[PDB]
Amino acid sequence: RRVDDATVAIRSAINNLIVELIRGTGSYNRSSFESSSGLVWTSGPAGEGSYSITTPSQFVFLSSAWADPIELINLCTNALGNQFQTQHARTVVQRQFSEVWKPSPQVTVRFPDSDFKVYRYNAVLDPLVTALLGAFDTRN
Amino acid sequence: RRVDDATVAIRSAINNLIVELIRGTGSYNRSSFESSSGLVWTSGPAGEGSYSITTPSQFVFLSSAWADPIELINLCTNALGNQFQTQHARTVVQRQFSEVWKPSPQVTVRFPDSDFKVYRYNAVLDPLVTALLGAFDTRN
Amino acid sequence: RRVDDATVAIRSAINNLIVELIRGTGSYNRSSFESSSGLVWTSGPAGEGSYSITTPSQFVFLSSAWADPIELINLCTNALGNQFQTQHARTVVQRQFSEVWKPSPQVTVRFPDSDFKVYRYNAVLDPLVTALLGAFDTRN
Amino acid sequence: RRVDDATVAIRSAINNLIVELIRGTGSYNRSSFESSSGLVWTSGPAGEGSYSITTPSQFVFLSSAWADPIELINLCTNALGNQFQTQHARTVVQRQFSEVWKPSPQVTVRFPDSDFKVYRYNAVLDPLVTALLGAFDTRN
Amino acid sequence: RRVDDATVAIRSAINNLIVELIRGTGSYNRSSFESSSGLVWTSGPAGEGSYSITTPSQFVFLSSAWADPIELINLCTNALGNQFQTQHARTVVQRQFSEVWKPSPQVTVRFPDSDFKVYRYNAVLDPLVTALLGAFDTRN
Amino acid sequence: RRVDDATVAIRSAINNLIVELIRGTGSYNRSSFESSSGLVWTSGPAGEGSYSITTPSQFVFLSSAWADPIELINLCTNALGNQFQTQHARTVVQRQFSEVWKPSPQVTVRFPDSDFKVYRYNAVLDPLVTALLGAFDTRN
Amino acid sequence: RRVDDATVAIRSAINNLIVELIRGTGSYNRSSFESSSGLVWTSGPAGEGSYSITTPSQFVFLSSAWADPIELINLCTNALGNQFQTQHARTVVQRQFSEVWKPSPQVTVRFPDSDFKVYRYNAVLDPLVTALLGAFDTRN
Amino acid sequence: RRVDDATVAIRSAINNLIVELIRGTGSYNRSSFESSSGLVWTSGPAGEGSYSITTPSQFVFLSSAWADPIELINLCTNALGNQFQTQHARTVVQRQFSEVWKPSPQVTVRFPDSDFKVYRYNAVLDPLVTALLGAFDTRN
Amino acid sequence: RRVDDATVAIRSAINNLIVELIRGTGSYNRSSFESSSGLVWTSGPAGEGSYSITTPSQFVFLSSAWADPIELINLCTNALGNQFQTQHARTVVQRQFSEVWKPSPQVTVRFPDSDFKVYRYNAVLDPLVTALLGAFDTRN
Amino acid sequence: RRVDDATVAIRSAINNLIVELIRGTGSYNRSSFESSSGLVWTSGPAGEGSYSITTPSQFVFLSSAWADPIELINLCTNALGNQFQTQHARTVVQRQFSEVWKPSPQVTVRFPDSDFKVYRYNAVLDPLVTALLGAFDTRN
Numbered sequence A, B, C, D, E, F, G, H, I, J: 001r002r003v004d005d006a007t008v009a010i011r012s013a014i015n016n017l018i019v020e021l022i023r024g025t026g027s028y029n030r031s032s033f034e035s036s037s038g039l040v041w042t043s044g045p046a047g048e049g050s051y052s053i054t055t056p057s058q059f060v061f062l063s064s065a066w067a068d069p070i071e072l073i074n075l076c077t078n079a080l081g082n083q084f085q086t087q088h089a090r091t092v093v094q095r096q097f098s099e100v101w102k103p104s105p106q107v108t109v110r111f112p113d114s115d116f117k118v119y120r121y122n123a124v125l126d127p128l129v130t131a132l133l134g135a136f137d138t139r140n
């Protein structure tokens, strides 16, 4: 009797994450990333460079917390077509939603010039992703 | 006693999706796609090209979220003649409705010249397809 | 005790479909098809040709949704003489009513010159066929 | 306790069909068939010919829906002497009443010159034959 | 407790059929047959001939619905001395009362010159024979 | 292990009957029947007549031993496609091959004017039909 | 251990039938049918006509022994992709190969004007179809 | 112990089909199809037309025996990565290799203008596809 | 006792594929792809274009048969650290090695300008990938 | 009796890897990496840059195939003190030896300026690491 509630909660979390991903919120380019994080890129001699860390909070921006937008929305699309009545599908898509966040900007690696990335800890996407990952945590 | 409710819900979702697909809503050609998505095709040197991304929301338009109209309506027709009292048919047609959405427009691939495509995240078709995919998620 | 209700519902749906097929409703020749679908056939160079698509809804007219009238009415006649108390007969005749709809008009294939075809998504036949296919979806 | 009701219903349906067959209703020769169905036989070049279809309803007249009167009344006579308490006899005589309807008039095959035929979808015989075929659909 | 009722009903039906057969009702010679059926015999070239059919109801007169009076009354006499408490006797004598009706007059075969025949569908014998054949349809 | 031998024997008998029916042997019209049977038709007063019996052997020609050629060859065709590993199919097609023989010529009924009939006791067809009917007599 | 042999025999029979159907052998139009069967079509008054029967063997040509070439080769193609290890597939495709033979030429119905038909008892196709129908007759 | 042999045979058949598909053999365009099949396209009045059938062998070319080359080679690629130790995968990929053959050229529908098609009954591909479909027929 | 052999075979196939991937064989850029496949890219007006197909073999080059080299070698690295004694790991890494091949060049989509891709049907990599995918097909 | 052999093989592989890691073989800095891989770093505008790929083999150098030397030798030290008689320890340390290889040089990320990295596919370390990962693949 709890599997139905688990399925409904999973679907609701996926739909809310999809609603916010459609509007594009939580997606950053180089400009928005370096502006909102306060990280300034200095291009030392000659082919490398580095970000100037001013507060430790910026370290969150340099963690494994970025995913490709197309990959993430495709993951949502394919997840909506799963048998969440089963524990196996829940485990698999939970691991998929957890592992999709990879690092892109680092202390010595500048944010990509033209690509966009999805921030795991964006103020709007963070609660949705947290509730989504928590919705799979229901066993029988 | 829940299999009957699952069957009725599945049939209702299929009927609603069919009702909206008959009117052609959610179907895009190159003109309507590039108009509603805001994506402008620039023809870089020389035989290729790319879409100009102005907001990250447009990434949803470039995901795996497009299906052939004839294939989709034939899928609906053939799905309406299944024994949804069985779990096997539910799983199979759920996978069919989930995998019918493939990518067609990409960052370096312009929308097809003359063909039409069905948008998974069209404002009208999105809730119907979501409810349809969720209706199969009922096990015994 | 539900098999009796399933049998009665199946028989009623078959009888209603028969009543509307007898009156000839939902049957199209080349003239009526090209008139009601708005598809105009242009005879391009030189021995072939194509239909001019003006709205995407017309794609439903070009799907696998056409059946021979005599074949369909014979299917109904022979189906009325089945043991629908059994699940096997229900499954078999459901598959028969689902697979009888084949494609005939296409974008590059004109509607047959003299034959008649039954439209799966005719405004009158659509609910009858839907209710018929749903009546077989009852198991024990 | 339902086998008695099934037997009584089967016998009542057979008796009603017999009552209407005794009066000769639903029997057509070439003249009455081609007059009441509106099908006009045109003798194309040179030794053959075809019926001219003016409305699609006429297709019902060209289906597998004709039986020999003597064969049908003999089937009724022999059916009245069966043990309908058994499911096997019900199934067998249901198949017999279903297979007695064969095609005689076709698009390229004219109605027989002198014989008479019984119309499965005659306005009077249709409900009786339908109820008869449905009366056998009772299991225990 | 139902076998006694079945036996009593069978005996009552046999007694009623016997009562009407004793009076000779439902027995026809060539004169009475050709008078009551309206069938007129024309002697075509040269040693044969045929009946002139004026209405299709007459076809019932030419079916397998005729029995020898002596054979039928002997069948009744011997049937009254059976153990109808058993299902076997019921089945056997039901088949005997069903198979006694054979064809004798046909479209191209005139009624026998001097013999008498019993008409299965005589207005008086029809309900009695029907009720008799139906009385055997009782199992335990 | 005996059902395989029974199946092979049944198929061989059906094939032999088919081979001899293809050549048309054992098929009679009025001329060949009245010539080979020695029965002479005298046209007594006035529209009827009778055959003049000269030897009692001719009585075999007047028994229930005639079948329509097309019906018989169709019976063979459909019988070749049965599951004779099962007892049910063997019993059913045995009864079908036994009941197809009906009477046509009688002492007071001349052979049909234009039709053909198959003689059950034709010198060639008799052993084939006998072996066929005997091949089904194998049970477990 | 016998199911493997049954499967191999079924596949071999289907392959041989396909090999001979590819070359078109056993396929007849009106000219070849009326030439090889000896049946001469006389166009009686006025839009109909009849075949002149000279020997009873010709009745085989007028039986239910004709199939559409495209339908038959499609049946073979789809049958080659079945699980013949199962009895169900064997029974079903045996019934399909048995029922594909329908009547087309009759005594009062001339061979179709332009279509082609496959002769069930053609000298080359007869043994292949017989062996095919017999190969399915293996149960456990 | 037989599942290993079945798997090896399946893999060998898939590899052989891939070997011949890589070289492109058995693939036809409009030119090669109309040249090797002998079918000549006449452009009747006015926007349609038809193929002129000169021998019945050409009917094989007009059956459901054509597949897209890219779809077929992708099917082979994905099939090579299955767990053929299981019966389910064997059944599924057998159905996939059986259903990939669809009709494209018809009597009134010319071969596609620019596309290519794979001929199920090409002299080289026919035995390979037959052996492939037959290799899956191994159960326990 | 067969799981050890299965593990050893899997490891040997992975090591051979790794040996050939280290040398870079089977990797193509735009130049090598368009040179070895014979496909010539024409840049029609204005932002799109197409490849000119000269033989059907080239269709293999346009299928879903390309993988990123880094992704493929990382897949090999991670696969070498699995518990192939278990069936689950075998199934998972088999599906991973089967699904890693995606399409990149198409008829209307030119090969990427600067990236490299791994050809599934390269003359050297094809047997190794086939043997690798077949090595996982061993169950207990 | 196989767990002892598995333990001995695991310990031997760890000892061989340790023997080669002590001598420092397979460890690269920026100079040795860019010398042995042939990858030349070009400093595009302005603070970033990229490696110039001349042959596809170099892609192996840019995969997830690098580990910190101290982390790897500490992993070996701590692994030598495990209870490899248990399956759990084998699985865990196998995953540890598989996941220690991470990417460090990328197409747009130059090799670290002063740190050292251990190359998974070094000519000497490759067989040792492969045999080590394979030694854990023994279950009971």
Ligand code: HEM
Pocket: B088, B091, B092, B093, B095, B096, H088, H091, H092, H095
């Ligand atoms: C018992 C649990 C089973 C599960 C979880 C299962 C799962 C699946 C899945 C995931 C598919 C793919 C559907 C798609 O790609 O759209 C499928 C297809 C299929 N399965 Fe099963 N299956 C089961 C049992 C069976 C069995 C026992 C049979 C046959 C004996 C069977 C027959 C088929 C067939 C014929 C298809 C192909 C349907 C199509 O045309 O796409 N299934 N099944």
Ligand code: HEM
Pocket: C088, C091, C092, C093, C095, C096, G088, G091, G092, G095
């Ligand atoms: C137990 C589960 C069974 C299932 C799910 C099943 C399913 C099917 C299906 C899907 C068809 C095809 C219907 C069509 O294409 O219109 C069919 C046909 C058929 N089956 Fe079964 N079947 C079962 C058992 C059996 C058995 C055990 C037998 C015989 C011993 C049988 C006899 C037949 C026959 C004779 C047909 C042909 C019906 C026709 O003429 O169209 N079935 N069945």
Ligand code: HEM
Pocket: D088, D091, D092, D093, D095, D096, F088, F091, F092, F095
């Ligand atoms: C147990 C399940 C059985 C089923 C589902 C079954 C089914 C059928 C069917 C479908 C027919 C064809 C009826 C027609 O074509 O109108 C038939 C006929 C027949 N069956 Fe069975 N049968 C069963 C048992 C048996 C058995 C065990 C026997 C004999 C030992 C038997 C004897 C016959 C006979 C004699 C006929 C011929 C009826 C006629 O003349 O039309 N049946 N049965």
Ligand code: HEM
Pocket: E088, E091, E092, E093, E095, E096
């Ligand atoms: C158990 C189920 C049985 C059934 C369904 C059955 C069925 C039949 C049928 C259909 C007839 C032919 C009736 C007619 O043509 O008028 C008959 C006659 C007969 N049966 Fe049975 N039978 C059964 C058992 C038996 C047994 C076990 C015996 C003997 C040990 C037996 C002895 C006879 C006899 C002697 C006749 C001849 C009746 C006559 O002279 O007309 N029956 N039965």
Ligand code: HEM
Pocket: A088, A091, A092, A095, I088, I091, I092, I093, I095, I096
């Ligand atoms: C018992 C039967 C099982 C079957 C038939 C099965 C089937 C599958 C399939 C088809 C995949 C997809 C692999 C891919 O897409 O590459 C998968 C992945 C996976 N399964 Fe299972 N599974 C089973 C048991 C389990 C169990 C019991 C667990 C965990 C308790 C599990 C954990 C996983 C995980 C973590 C993945 C993700 C692998 C990846 O990263 O791609 N599996 N499984």
Ligand code: HEM
Pocket: J088, J091, J092, J093, J095, J096
């Ligand atoms: C019975 C089957 C079991 C399996 C297949 C299994 C599998 C695994 C796996 C895959 C890891 C990850 C290793 C890594 O990331 O390097 C792990 C770690 C671990 N497991 Fe298990 N486990 C099992 C049972 C248990 C149980 C019952 C316990 C404790 C009661 C346990 C205690 C641990 C611990 C403490 C770790 C952390 C090791 C570390 O420091 O990385 N395991 N196990």
